[PDB]
């Protein structure tokens, strides 16, 4: 940098631009924190709903395993077809792309049209609703993680 008056003015203009950029990035960090502090509340609500789902599904499975017998429960488990009906579509948030989990969850494709076992069918229903809540929990938590990473990158 050769010392001239024009270069001095150019340096002072750069200092002004740097200060204004610092303030603008501070405002962006404020907005990101504002989004994060609500996303965490939604995630907490989803987790505490998933806990109740776990309670009732585990109660149903535990009661069905003893009364009916593990043999018929296993037979129903082989009877039920496996499902891979999840499509990882990608959601755009804050200039970055995150995966969003969408579940197909078809009805009527499963076996046992009527409940020939006494309690296994209810346990299957409870665990299916468990999966339906678990996908929501994962969906909110991944967005929380990405927003946190953006906050760290800005700071």
């Amino acid at each position: 940098v050769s010392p001239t008056r024009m270069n001095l003015l150019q340096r002072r203009g750069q200092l002004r631009l740097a200060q204004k950029g610092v303030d603008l990035l501070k405002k962006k960090r404020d907005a990101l924190v504002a989004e994060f502090f609500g996303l965490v509340r939604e995630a907490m609500e989803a987790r505490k709903a998933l806990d109740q789902a776990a309670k009732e599904a585990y109660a149903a499975l535990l009661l069905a395993q003893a009364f009916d017998g593990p043999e018929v429960v296993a037979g129903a488990a082989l009877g039920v077809p496996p499902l891979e009906g999840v499509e990882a579509e990608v959601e755009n948030v804050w200039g970055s792309k995150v995966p969003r989990l969408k579940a197909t969850f078809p009805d009527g494709a499963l076996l046992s049209p009527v409940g020939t076992p006494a309690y296994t069918l209810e346990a299957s229903r409870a665990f299916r609703r468990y999966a339906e809540a678990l996908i929501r929990v994962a969906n909110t938590e991944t967005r929380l993680k990405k927003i946190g990473e953006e906050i760290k990158k800005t700071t």
Binding site: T4, R5, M6, L17, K20, G21, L24, L25, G95
Partner: protein, 192 residues
């Protein structure tokens, strides 16, 4: 001496001339000519020549010139953020302004003094180029709000039609202009 514009002769000349055409070394390094610094240049004869321009060129020519100046000012405003967070952090409505400013800078302002055709340019040719650029910008601005991603727009073949209108001869320009204006509408209706 050394490009220092605070020289006594440079400062004395600044206080008596009516127009000031400042040149930049950074533009001459990358072979961008005439290398006029848009930010540091000015002219005081702009407001007095409007009655001549309206009668001899077109009725809306000063409005087009002011719109071009406003676009250049807006592009100059956004460049402080591009240096700070990169070009990709901008929204598509601002990326459109950046790309239109780049198109204006590389097409309208740039001129080759040694080329066989581009060395001389009449006022009506420049008016046609300005009209084409503003029509493209308006169509692109309308397309963004409809839902088209900007990466679709800046690959249309009409960009090469615009970008090579410099080398069209003076006698052949009216047909090229009327073809390009129809091509703009033909291209921008098929996006979404």
């Amino acid at each position: 001496p050394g490009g220092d514009m605070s020289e006594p002769v440079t400062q004395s000349t600044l206080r008596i001339v009516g127009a000031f055409w400042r040149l930049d070394a950074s533009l001459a390094f990358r072979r961008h000519f005439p290398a006029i610094n848009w930010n540091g240049s000015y002219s005081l004869f702009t407001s007095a020549l409007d009655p001549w321009y309206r009668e001899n060129v077109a009725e809306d020519y000063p409005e087009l010139r002011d719109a071009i100046s406003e676009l250049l000012q807006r592009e100059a405003g956004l460049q402080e953020i591009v240096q700070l967070v990169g070009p990709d952090a901008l929204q598509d409505a601002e990326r459109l302004v950046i790309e239109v400013g780049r198109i204006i800078r590389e097409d309208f302002l740039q001129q080759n003094a040694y080329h066989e055709v581009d060395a001389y340019c009449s006022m009506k040719k420049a008016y046609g180029i300005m009209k084409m650029i503003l029509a493209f910008y308006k169509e692109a601005e309308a397309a963004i709000k409809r839902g088209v991603s900007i990466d679709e727009i800046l690959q249309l073949p009409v960009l090469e039609r615009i970008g090579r209108a410099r080398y069209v001869s003076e006698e052949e320009f009216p047909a090229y202009f009327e073809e390009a204006m129809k091509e703009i509408q033909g291209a921008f209706k098929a996006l979404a």
